[PDB]
Amino acid sequence: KVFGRCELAAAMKRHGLDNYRGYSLGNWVCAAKFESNFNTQATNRNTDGSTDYGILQINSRWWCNDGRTPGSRNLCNIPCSALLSSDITASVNCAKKIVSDGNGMNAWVAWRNRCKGTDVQAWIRGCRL
Numbered sequence: 001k002v003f004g005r006c007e008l009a010a011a012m013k014r015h016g017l018d019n020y021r022g023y024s025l026g027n028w029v030c031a032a033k034f035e036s037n038f039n040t041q042a043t044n045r046n047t048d049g050s051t052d053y054g055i056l057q058i059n060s061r062w063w064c065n066d067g068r069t070p071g072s073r074n075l076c077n078i079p080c081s082a083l084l085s086s087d088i089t090a091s092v093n094c095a096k097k098i099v100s101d102g103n104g105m106n107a108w109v110a111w112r113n114r115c116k117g118t119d120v121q122a123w124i125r126g127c128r129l
Contacts (some may be wrong), residue, residue, distance in 0.1 A: 001086035003038040003055070005029065006127035008088075013129060015092040021099050025129075026120035027111065032056055033123065034110035040086050054083035054091045056108065063094055 003011065009029050012018070018025035035057040036042035044052045050061040050069045060069040064080035076094035083091050098107050105111045 001040045003032075003040070005033070005038065005123065006129075008032060008038055008055075009124055009127045009129065011088050012092065015088065017092060017095075020096065021104065023099065023105055024120055024124075026123040027105060027115060029123040030115035030118070030120050031105065031108045031111035034114040035108055040088070040091075041084055043084070051080070053080045055088060056091050056095050057110075058083050058091065058094055058098065063098065 009025060012028050013025055017023075017028045032038055032055050036055045038055065040055050042054065042057065044057065046052065046059075048061060050059050050072070051066060052059050053064065053066070058064055058076070058080070060066040060080050061072050063074070063076045064078050064083055065072060065074040066080040076090075076097055078090055078094065083094065099105060101107065105116070
């Protein structure tokens with residue numbers, strides 16, 4: 001599913017991400033934009049042999065099981081295929097673990113390259129929220 005920007009922003013707010021761990025909703029929308037371009041089906045195979053899944057590009061080395069990643073753990077306790085669905089619940093619940101794991105939103109490399117320290121309040125513009 002490819003979300004619309006405010007459609008995703010509403011979905012995320014409904015799942016408790018606005019100011020979660022002090023991070024504005026705009027931070028979350030900016031990261032999903034630069035991680036997956038709002039597409040729930042996006043995957044990236046890394047050289048690691050790991051793959052990033054879904055709208056927030058969660059990695060299979062630590063967070064979800066895809067059964068092809070050497071030395072993977074499954075900290076979110078889900079199959080990585082569940083992170084490819086049109087409903088964002090599984091992705092958001094896992095992202096809530098990842099953001100509290102100790103590097104805040106620095107865990108998403110596209111957030112730190114394109115969103116960190118910018119006016120992220122621009123990503124929520126025109127969203128009736």
